[PDB]
Symmetry: C2
Subunit: 145 residues, 2 copies
């Protein structure tokens, strides 16, 4: 019933678990901000946390509409503390660039397999990822002022 | 054409709404730049660019479904607002109109069992919810 390859289902499945860890990382950034009493930065991390679950569930439902199956993996414990405000956001940017590269790797994999549906599915996330990296760069830019 | 004329017209209308939103955000950049709010202006210019990418998504989807795009005249946007908060409230009010308009196309596309168009729009429903919350977040931070 699967109209994607195993290599593609696997890579999509891996990304879903990365989106889940992303939500968890952002949640853990919330705990740091909130403990430092930066309640607005924390509110942004909790919103980002809920959005990354939106990302993960988008991968979920794509995997299944293409006849695949999802296996959830263990979620590593995220850091719960950073050396200041700028450093936590630098970590967010670092993580978002990591997510971007991983999505790029799936896109090239899907193109070499002539998988049009998965290429087209992924282009939506490339744009969101460009937006999400620029968001952090803007925050970092404004903090060094 | 594998979309109905009703959906095509709805999608072409939204394309022109994205085109206008881009021009609105550019106009807001002219205001922020005039007033020295250079960083705000950069946000507007990036948003103007993004709204154009929204326009070209609808463009390509229409042609991919066998429809045609027709570009309408672009209204002159406001040039000036009464301060930063006023500029961002207008943005928020404009985003809410864009959100409603997309839902109306989603409603119509569902009723016609146009599955491809439902699936296309659900990306925009989610982007719209984020874009609304971004400017709402700005406004809350301005009350400060
Ligand atoms: Co808040
Ligand atoms: Co994500
Ligand atoms: Co992200
Ligand atoms: Co977005
Ligand atoms: Co986002
Ligand atoms: Co910038
Ligand atoms: Co800037
Ligand atoms: Co738009
Ligand atoms: Co918009
Ligand atoms: Co956006
Ligand atoms: Co808020």
């Amino acid at each position: 019933m699967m109209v994607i390859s195993e290599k593609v289902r696997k890579a999509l499945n891996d990304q879903l678990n990365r989106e889940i860890y992303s939500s968890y990382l952002y949640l853990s950034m919330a705990t740091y901000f909130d403990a430092e009493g930066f309640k607005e930065f924390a509110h942004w991390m909790k919103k980002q946390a809920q959005e990354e679950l939106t990302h993960a569930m988008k991968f979920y439902e794509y995997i299944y509409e293409r006849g695949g199956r999802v296996e959830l993996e263990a979620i590593e414990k995220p850091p719960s503390n950073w050396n200041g405000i700028k450093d936590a956001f630098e970590a967010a940017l670092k993580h978002e660039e990591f997510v971007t590269q991983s999505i790029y790797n799936i896109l090239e994999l899907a193109s070499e397999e002539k998988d049009h549906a998965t290429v087209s599915f992924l282009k939506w996330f490339v744009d969101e990822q460009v937006e999400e990296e620029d968001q952090v760069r803007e925050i970092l830019d404004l903090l060094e002022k």
